[PDB]
Design a binder for this molecule. Structure first.
Ligand SMILES: CC(=O)N[C@H]1[C@H](O[C@H]2[C@H](O)[C@@H](NC(C)=O)[C@H](O[C@H]3[C@@H](OP(=O)(O)OC[C@@H](OC/C=C(/C)CCC=C(C)C)C(=O)O)O[C@H](C(N)=O)[C@@](C)(O)[C@@H]3OC(N)=O)O[C@@H]2CO[C@@H]2O[C@H](CO)[C@@H](O)[C@H](O)[C@H]2O)O[C@H](C)[C@@H](O[C@@H]2O[C@H](C(N)=O)[C@H](O)[C@H](O)[C@H]2O)[C@@H]1O
Ligand SMILES: CC(=O)N[C@H]1[C@H](O[C@H]2[C@H](O)[C@@H](NC(C)=O)[C@H](O[C@H]3[C@@H](OP(=O)(O)OC[C@@H](OC/C=C(/C)CCC=C(C)C)C(=O)O)O[C@H](C(N)=O)[C@@](C)(O)[C@@H]3OC(N)=O)O[C@@H]2CO[C@@H]2O[C@H](CO)[C@@H](O)[C@H](O)[C@H]2O)O[C@H](C)[C@@H](O[C@@H]2O[C@H](C(N)=O)[C@H](O)[C@H](O)[C@H]2O)[C@@H]1O
Lengths: 174, 174
């Protein structure tokens, strides 16, 4: 699994943008933790990309308040150590996307039989829909809600200004 | 400080080899933790490069048995997530090397006024001597033991087969 790394410079804007719009809209500006996100979400998760990266660096996967804090501290240090593009790179190569695919390149091959850099806008959006719950939104056997969440990602991209109305209309119909 | 990243492919073999020979000779083969190293060292530290990377990912810097273990668990997971060349890359860009220099490129500029890829064998060895204690072996004000430890690094490189006898003799005299 730990074989399929791809540098950020070879990952299309649509893929990077789809993940940002869906999981952490303020990714490029916060310091590893986002209060405005937590509050507005306290009303929907509030964890940043950095926090997810940190969470997946642990060996055992428990969800106690105790380690949520440890994950937040780790996230802040990482943010102090590596830049945004690097954190995004590590994250996009480690993320479990279902069907035994860890990372965007492996996911691209498993779900579309191609390299991440050959992905279309609608294909990029499908990958960004999986992190929430890979097995729950897996196209290979829950194509109904996979398509629904994909269109929801495209909607988030449209709202954030990452794609045009024209592009949106074409993608949701693919 | 978090501004001066350089990909592994632009870091000279001598630099990578100098760090491996000095800090973790079996780096390329272990799984994040090295028993043979710990035992043989129990007789000299026994922590791997991966463990040092993990140690520096924490925010606060305490040295209790409690977190040494947490660092070992983190190291094992990292090893499962990213490959050797990537772990080496992250490590060589994060390592504090004294005089406010974090990473090999920043160190190269501060100590030699040049890019890491323009470093000679004797210059690479000096950087590998700092991690043990940057302020204790700093050339800028403890050139005596900096030179001593540099020559000790070159000796380790010679022993590991990373440099030739000819190269060794030339470097220790620089
Ligand atoms: C169902 C599914 O899709 N599972 C796969 C999983 O998919 C993960 C998926 O990998 C994981 N994503 C990342 C990036 O880590 C995802 O996280 C979500 C999940 O996170 P999590 O459960 O860790 O709780 C975190 C929460 O702290 C909460 C704690 C607090 C103390 C609150 C904090 C307080 C505040 C005020 C903030 C928080 O504040 O965010 O919920 C968040 C939330 N509610 O806000 C979330 C929506 O923001 C979050 O999404 C992201 N992107 O971070 O959760 C899903 C599944 O959650 C499942 O929820 C079920 C009931 O709700 C539980 O029973 C499950 O145990 C739990 O896993 O990814 C794993 C890597 C897979 O593991 C593999 O499974 C394979 C297989 N069979 O498919 C093989 O067995 C293989 O060997 C094995 O390694 C799993 O099979
Ligand atoms: C003296 C010096 O050079 N200090 C700078 C430091 O330099 C670090 C340096 O950054 C650090 N290297 C890395 C990669 O993290 C270095 O680690 C060594 C050190 O590690 P550590 O103290 O964390 O103990 C780890 C130990 O767990 C031990 C625990 C157990 C429970 C045992 C486990 C049991 C087993 C059976 C294994 C183990 O098993 O390895 O000793 C190891 C050992 N004895 O085996 C070692 C030789 O293997 C190890 O070397 C490496 N490469 O991992 O230690 C030196 C200094 O150690 C100092 O030792 C003194 C007395 O011996 C203590 O009083 C000091 O507190 C301690 O730091 O790096 C920091 C980043 C600098 O911080 C900056 O300072 C600046 C400044 N003023 O210069 C500014 O203030 C700035 O704002 C601030 O951020 C520091 O200024």
């Amino acid at each position: 699994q730990k074989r399929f790394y791809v540098s950020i410079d070879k990952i299309p804007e649509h893929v990077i943008n789809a993940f940002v719009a869906t999981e952490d809209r303020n990714f490029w500006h916060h310091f590893g933790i986002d209060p405005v996100a937590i509050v507005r979400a306290a009303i929907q998760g509030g964890s940043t990309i950095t926090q997810q990266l940190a969470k997946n660096l642990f060996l055992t996967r428990e969800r106690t308040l105790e380690r949520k804090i440890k994950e937040a501290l780790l996230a802040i240090k990482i943010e102090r150590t590596f830049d945004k593009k690097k954190i995004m790179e590590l994250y996009l190569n480690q993320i479990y996307l279902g069907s035994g695919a860890y990372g965007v390149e492996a996911a691209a091959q498993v779900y579309f039989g191609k390299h991440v850099w050959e992905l279309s806008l609608d294909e990029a959006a499908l990958l960004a829909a999986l992190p929430k719950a890979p097995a729950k939104y897996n196209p290979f056997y829950h194509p109904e809600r996979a398509l629904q969440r994909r269109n929801l990602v495209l909607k988030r991209m449209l709202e954030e200004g990452y794609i045009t109305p024209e592009q949106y209309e074409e993608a949701v119909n693919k």
